[PDB]
């Protein structure tokens, strides 16, 4: 298995409120992957863009991992690694940013 605690963008289990305060002051492109407290073993991407903190569901269906149906990956790591180099705009027109800065900076 993959130990995600070794990555500077993994916040573990964390509420949305706790995330909004952690990313409100950082630059656009600052992000973190967190476990949703209300959904066990389901994760979300939280990305700072403009002056808001967006939250994207990480869906797991039919052994694929994806934030959009049109682009799927074999693991959460491959998903995060892809959007570190490709903007979210390709599937979220209002989110023209990559996963630029891990929130542990």
């Amino acid at each position: 298995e993959i130990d995600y605690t070794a990555y500077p963008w993994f916040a573990g289990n964390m509420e949305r409120q706790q995330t909004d305060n952690l990313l409100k002051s950082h630059a656009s492109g600052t992000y973190l992957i967190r476990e949703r407290p209300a959904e066990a073993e389901r994760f979300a991407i939280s990305i700072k863009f403009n002056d808001e903190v967006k939250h994207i569901k990480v869906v797991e269906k039919d052994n694929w991992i994806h934030i959009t149906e049109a682009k799927k990956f074999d693991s959460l790591l491959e998903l995060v690694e892809y959007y570190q180099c490709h903007s979210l705009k390709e599937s979220f027109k209002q989110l023209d940013t990559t996963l630029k800065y891990p929130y542990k900076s």
């Binding site: 979300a44 967006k54 939250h55 994207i56 569901k57 869906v59 934030i67 959009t68 979220f92 989110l95």
Partner: peptide, 5 residues
Amino acid sequence: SYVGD
């Protein structure tokens, strides 16, 4: 509440 939905 989430971008997707």
